[PDB]
Amino acid sequence: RAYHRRVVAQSKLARERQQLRAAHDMLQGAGHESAALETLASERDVSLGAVERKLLAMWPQMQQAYSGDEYVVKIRDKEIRTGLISTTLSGTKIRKVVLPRFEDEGEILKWLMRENVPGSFPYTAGVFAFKREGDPTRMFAGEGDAFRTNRRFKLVSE
Amino acid sequence: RGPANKVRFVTAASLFDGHDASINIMRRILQSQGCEVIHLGHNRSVQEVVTAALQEDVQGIAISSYQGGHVEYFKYMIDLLREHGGEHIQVFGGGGGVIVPDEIRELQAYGVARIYSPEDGQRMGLAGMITDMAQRCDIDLTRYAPTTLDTVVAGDRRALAQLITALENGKADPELVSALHAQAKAAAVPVLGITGTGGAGKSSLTDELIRRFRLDQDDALSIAVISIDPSRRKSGGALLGDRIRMNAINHPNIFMRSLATREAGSEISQALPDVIAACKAARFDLVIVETSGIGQGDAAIVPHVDLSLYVMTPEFGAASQLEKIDMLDFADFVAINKFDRKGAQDAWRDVAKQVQRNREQWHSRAEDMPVYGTQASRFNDDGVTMLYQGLVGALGARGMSLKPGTLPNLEGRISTGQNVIVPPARSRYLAELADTVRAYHRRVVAQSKLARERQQLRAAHDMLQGAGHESAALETLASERDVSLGAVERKLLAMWPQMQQAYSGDEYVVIRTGLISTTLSGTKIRKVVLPRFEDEGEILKWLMRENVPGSFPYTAGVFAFKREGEDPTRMFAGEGDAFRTNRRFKLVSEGMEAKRLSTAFDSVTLYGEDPHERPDIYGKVGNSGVSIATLEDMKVLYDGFDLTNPSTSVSMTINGPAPTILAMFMNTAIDQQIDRFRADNGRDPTADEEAKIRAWVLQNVRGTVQADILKEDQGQNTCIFSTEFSLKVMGDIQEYFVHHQVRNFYSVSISGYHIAEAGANPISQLAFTLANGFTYVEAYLARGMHIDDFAPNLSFFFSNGMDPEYSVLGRVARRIWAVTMRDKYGANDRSQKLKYHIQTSGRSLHAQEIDFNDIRTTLQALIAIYDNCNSLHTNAYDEAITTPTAESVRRALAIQLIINREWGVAKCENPNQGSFLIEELTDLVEEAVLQEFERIAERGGVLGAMETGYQRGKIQEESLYYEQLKHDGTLPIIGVNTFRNPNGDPTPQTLELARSSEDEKQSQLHRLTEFHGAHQADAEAMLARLRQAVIDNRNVFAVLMDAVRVCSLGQITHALFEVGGQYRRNM
Amino acid sequence: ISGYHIAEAGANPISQLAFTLANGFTYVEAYLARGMHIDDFAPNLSFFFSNGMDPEYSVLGRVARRIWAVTMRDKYGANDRSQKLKYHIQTSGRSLHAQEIDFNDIRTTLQALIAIYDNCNSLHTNAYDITTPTAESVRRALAIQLIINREWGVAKCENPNQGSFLIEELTDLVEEAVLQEFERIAERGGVLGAMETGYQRGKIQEESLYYEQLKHDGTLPIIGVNTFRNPNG
C-alpha cells in the first residue's frame, strides 16, 4: 500500500513538472517570458525521486528499443538479438511487446511503476523480457516398483 | 517440359454448387504444369459438363462437389460419358470431408478415376495431386480420330470434335485434309469472324448474338463456334476462358470448340483454316470465330472469314487513335460494346466518322455506317438486337436461307439502355469515404493537442497563484484555446465527469440498468469500465476514437448495454424437409425465452429450383439445408413460431432467389396473424380487418434476409439471374419496405463471411464488405431514397478466424461506418450504428482430428463476444464432414453458453478497451481497409472492379497463398501439418452424418405436384403478370408478394429467366 | 509453494492467492529466523496456482508477481533474481464435471488462454475425462496448448493483457483484496497462528459449501449440469 501511495505522489509531481515546462515553452512562443514558471518546475525536479526521475528519462530510449524489427542487448562481451515482429498472412506486423502511446508523463510514470514491460520491475507483465522459443513440459512417470518407473523414464526420454 | 501430348481438361463445380475455391486452385496448377483448361465455372449439371468435355475432346474432367449428392452426380456422369462415346475420358473429383472414404471407394469402383480426400492432399501435396491427375491423362487422343469424312459429314458431332483434335495436332492425313477443304469449298457456308481488344466483350456479345439467332429462328440454325484464347508459352498450356461466358450454346444444334493460340504472338491457331473447313463440311448453317485479345494493329482474322466484326469499348483514348487501328479498315461491322460506360456516345461518333472516312463514303451519312453501340451485359439489349438485324441482312445476301424473324425488327445503331446503378459523377465514392475517415482522425489529433495545452496552461496558472507569482498572461493563452476547441469537443470533455459518476454506481439511471456483477470471491465486476486518465488530451482522444458502448463513434458497440435475456446466439440450421428442420429449430431454441432462428436451404432451393427426379437434382434435395419449394413448405418450416412476436427473429440465408423466398416468409408471417385472428374470434376477418392485420404484420415482423448480390459475384456464387437484374429487384424490396414501413426487417445482410471462406484474409474481407455496403448506399441515394430511410435496414455479416486482425474486425467496421455515415452522408444516430452477425470460420476447422475444432471454435467465439457482436453462430466439431448432428450442435451451442454464463472476463462488456494491442491493431486494420478502398476506387468503384474481376482475382490469390502454406508447413495447423496422430486416422470409426431421408425426398415431390394441382388455373396467369412487371419496369417484389401464393419457387425463377436473364459467370 | 489443492478444495481465487502468498512469506520469515540471507533461498522458491472460470483468475498471476516483487525489494531488500516470482498454472479440475464430458475441453481452453496471456512460466492442461488418463485424452489436452501457442493470433503478442481497463482495474482490486486477507491472518497470529485455530481450513470449507450451494441452487449456471442438461441423461 505504501508503494502505491508513492506512485500516486510521484505521478502528480511528474505531471505538474511537465505541465509547467509545457506552459513555459508556450509563453515564450507568444513573446511573454515568465521564468517564475521554471522556478516551480525545478522545484519538482528535486521532489521526484532518483529512481523515478531515471524511469521517465529512459522512456524515449525504451520506445526506440521496442520499435524496430529486433531488440539488441549486449550481455558480457557479445550480444543477444531478439525478433520483435511476427507477420500475419495479411502482412500486418504484430509486435511481441506493445508499448503505450501516452503523452502525459504522469501516465507514463504511473504505468512504468505499476505495470512495466515484461522483464522489468515490478514484473507485472512477466519476469522475463520475451518468452522462450520452443518446452519445459516435464516427463511424468511413477507406478509399480522402482524398476517399472525407471523403464518408463528411459522410454519416454529416449 | 510439360506433358507428352496436348493434354486438355474440363473443370467445373457440381450442380447448384458454389464452392469454386477448391476447383480454382486446381485449374491453376493444371495450367502451370502445361495443360489447356476449359474452365466452366460453378453450378454445372452433368448434362453440361459432359457435353463440354465431348466437344472439346478432353482427356480429363475435374469436378468439385461440396453440396453432397455427389455419389448420384458422378455415377450419372460416368454413365452419360460411356453412353455417348467418352468412356476413355477420365473423371476426377473432390469435396473435402463431404465425400466420406466409403463413398470414394464406391465411386472409384464405379468408374471414377480418383477422388481426393483432405488426407490425400496432405500426403501428396497440392502439386502432387495435379501431377498424378495429369500423368494419368497424358494420352494421345488422335487414335480415336476418324480416317474418313463419312461420319463427320453425316452429322456426327463427336466425330467432328475428334477430327479437330487430329487436325489441330497435325496428325491428319494429307489426302484427308485436301479432301476436307474440297468439300468445305462446295459447302458454301458463311463464316463470321469476331475480333477485338482484350476483354471488350467478344465472348459475351457472341453468346448474345447466338441467343438472338435462336429466338429469331426457333433454334433451326446449326451454329459452330470456334473461340480462341492466348496461350502462355512459358507454362505450356492455356486458360481457354470463353466457354464460361456462353449461356446460349446449350442446345444440340450448337457446337463449340476452344482453341489455344499455341503461339505467344498470333491471335489465331496455326490450324484455324483447317478447323473452320472441318465445320463447313459438317453441314453447319453458320460458323462463328472469336479471336484472342488482339492489339490495335492486328487483323489476322480477316482473310479466314467471310464477315468480320470488330468489338471495342468507348475507352480508346484520343480520337486520333482510330487512324492507327488497322481493323477499322477491314471490319464489315463495328460493335462499340460496354455502351453503358462513360463517353460511349462520343465514342460512337468518332468511330462512325472514322469508318466513313476509311470507306470513302462521303455521300453517305455517318450515322448510316455499320457501327453499332451494344451492351452485351444487359439482357435483351436493343443495341445488340440492332447489330443482329444488320448481321442477318448481310448473311442473307451472302447465301444463307433464313425465315422471316420473330424479333423486333427495330431501327437505329445505338443502344438505349439508360439504367445506371452508380452515376459516373460518384465514381470515386470509396476514395471520398477514405478521405472522410482520415480527416476525422486528423481532427482528433488537433483537438486533443488543444485540449491538452488548455489544461496544461490552467494547471500552471493555479500552481503559480499557489506560490504567489501571478501571471494572467497564461490565462490569455488558455481562453485562446477555448475558442479553438470545437463546440462538440468542448462538450465532450465537459460531460466527462458527469459520465464517470454514471458508470460508477451499482445502477445506471436513464429506466434502470444494473452495472455490477459480483463474483464468488465478492469482487465487483463493472459492466463497462471507464479509463482513469488525468490528461484531458487523452480523455478527448479516447472519447472521439473509442467512446463507451452506445456512443459515437460506437467503436465498442452500438448499444449502451447488452440484452438482458436475449443472448446474441443464433444457430444456422437446415436439413431434410420443412418438417425435420422445424424440429431442429425447436431443439436450438429450446429453453430460450428469445427465439433467434437461422435457416439454411439446400442447394436446389439456393438456386431457385423445384425438386425433381433427375439424379442431377434429386440427390441434392434436402441435403445441406432445408428443401423449400412452395409457400406451404415455408409455413410448415416456421409453424409454432410467432414471427410477429417481438422476441422472435428469423434469419434466412438466401441470395439468388432471395426476393422470392422473402415473399414466402412475409406471406407466412401475415397468414399466421390471420389464423390467430380466426381463432380468437371464430370467424374470418373482414376485408377491412384483414387489411389492418396485414399492414401491422409488415411493420412489426422482425428478421433478416441476406440477398447481398455484390458478394455473389465476388464470393458465394449464388447469383442466378443477371447481376444487374438482381440489384434492380433488391432495390424494389427496399422500396417496398419503405412504403409499408417495414422497419424491423433487414432488407440485406451485407456479408463478407463468404468472401472470407473463399480464402480472403481478414483485411480483404472487411474492406470488400464495407465497400459493397457503401455501394448499396450510393446506389439507393442515386435512386432517390433518404439516407435515413434505408441505412437502418442494413445488416452486416462477418467471419471470425484465427488471424490477429479478427479480434478487432467488428470494432473497426463500426467506426468506419459511424464516422462516414455522420460526416459524409449526414445520416442520423440510428443509421451510424452498424449492426452485424459473426459466424466462426468454417474453413479453419478440419477433417483431421475433429475434436480439435472445438478448441478453435471456442477462441473464435470468445473474441466475437469480447468485441460486442450483435449475433453469433458457432460451428460444430464435425464441421468438415457434415451438417451439425444432434450431439454436434449441442457442443457448438455449449461454447456460447459457457462463455456467456460461466466465463469470468465475459461479465465485463468492454474488456477489449484500453488494451495497447487492441487499440494499435484497430488503427492498423482501419487504415489498411481505407487503402483498399482507394485501390477499388481507382478501378472504377466496386462495380468497376468486378468488371475486371479484381475482387475474385485477389480472393483467389490469397486463397492460394494460404493453401500453399497449409500444405507447406510454414503455417502450422495442429493435427494437420504438425502434431499428427501416431495412429494416422482422421475420425477412424463411423461418424453420424446429416443427410436427407428417401421418404423426405418423395414427400417434397408429392407436396409439389399437389401444390401445383391446387393452383393450376391461376399459375400461368400469375407468371405472365410477373414477366409484364419486369417488361413494364414496375416493382418486381410487389408482384412476388402475390406470386408465391399460386406459384412454386422453380416456376417463378424460370419465368424470370425469360425476362431477367441468367448470370454470366466471371472465372 | 502450492495452492492448487487449496483452490481445488473449494477456495475462491482471492482466498487461494492470499493463502498461498501468505504461506510463501511464512517460509521466508522461517528461513530468515535461522539467520539466513534472503538472496540464498528466495530465487529458488517456485509457485503453483489454479486457473478457473472466475474473473479474478485472469489477473491472478500478475498480482502474485507484483506483490512479491515489491515486498521482496522494499521490505526484505533482496536482489533482482529474488523479486521475480515464477509460477506454474494448472487448469481447474474441479470445474471439470462428469456430465457432458465433451464440454470440459471448452472450459479447459478458456482457462489455458488467460494463463498464457498473463505470461505464466509453466502450464498443465486437463483432459476432457472420470476414467484413466488415456493416451487419446492426453492428446486433446496437449492440443489445447499447441493450438493457442502456434495457431492463435492474439497469442503472437506477449503482453495482450496490458492496457486493458478491465485488467488493470481487476489487478488493483484483487491485490488489495489479498492485502486485506493478509491483515486478517496477521491478527490471528500469522499463518501458523491461524492454522492453530483452523482459520484457513474453516474458510476454505465455508467457500466450498457456498459454491456447492449456488450450484445446486441453480444460481450459478453450469452448462450441462444444472442447465442445458442432456435431454436423455
Ligand code: B12
Ligand atoms: C469455404 C466454404 C464455403 C464458402 C465457399 C467459398 C467459395 N467461393 O468456394 C461459402 C461460405 C460461400 C460456403 C457456402 C455454403 N456452404 Co460451404 N463450406 C466451406 C468449407 C468451410 C471449406 C470448403 C473449402 O473451400 N475448402 C478448401 C479446399 C481447398 O480444401 P479441402 O476441402 O480440404 O480439399 C482438399 C482435397 O479434398 C482436395 N480436393 C478437394 N476438391 C478437389 C477437387 C479437385 C479437382 C482435386 C484434384 C482435388 C480436390 O484439395 C484439397 C487439398 O488440401 C466447408 C467445410 C470444410 N471445412 O470442409 C463448408 C461446407 C462444404 N459447406 C457446406 C454448405 C452446406 C454450404 C451452403 C450450402 C450453406 C447454405 N445452406 O447456404 C452454402 C452455399 C454454397 C453455394 N453457394 O452453393 C457444408 C456441406 C454439407 C454437406 N455437403 O453435407 C460444409 C461441409 C460445411 C458444414 N459442415 O455444414 N461454403
Ligand SMILES: Nc1nc2c(ncn2[C@@H]2O[C@H](COP(=O)(O)OP(=O)(O)O)[C@@H](O)[C@H]2O)c(=O)[nH]1
Ligand atoms: N459494363 C459492361 N460490361 C460488359 C459488357 N459486356 C460484357 N461485359 C463484361 O466484360 C467482361 C469480359 O467479357 P468477355 O465476354 O469475356 O470479353 P472477351 O474476353 O473480349 O471475350 C465480363 O465481366 C463481362 O461481364 C457491357 O456491355 N458492359
Ligand SMILES: C[C@H]1O[C@@H](n2cnc3c(N)ncnc32)[C@H](O)[C@@H]1O
Ligand atoms: C458455409 C458455412 O455455413 C455453415 N453451415 C452450412 N450449412 C449448415 C447447416 N445446415 N447447419 C449449420 N451450419 C451450416 C458452416 O459453418 C459452413 O462453413
Ligand SMILES: [Mg+2]
Ligand atoms: Mg473472350
Ligand SMILES: [Mg+2]
Ligand atoms: Mg477470346
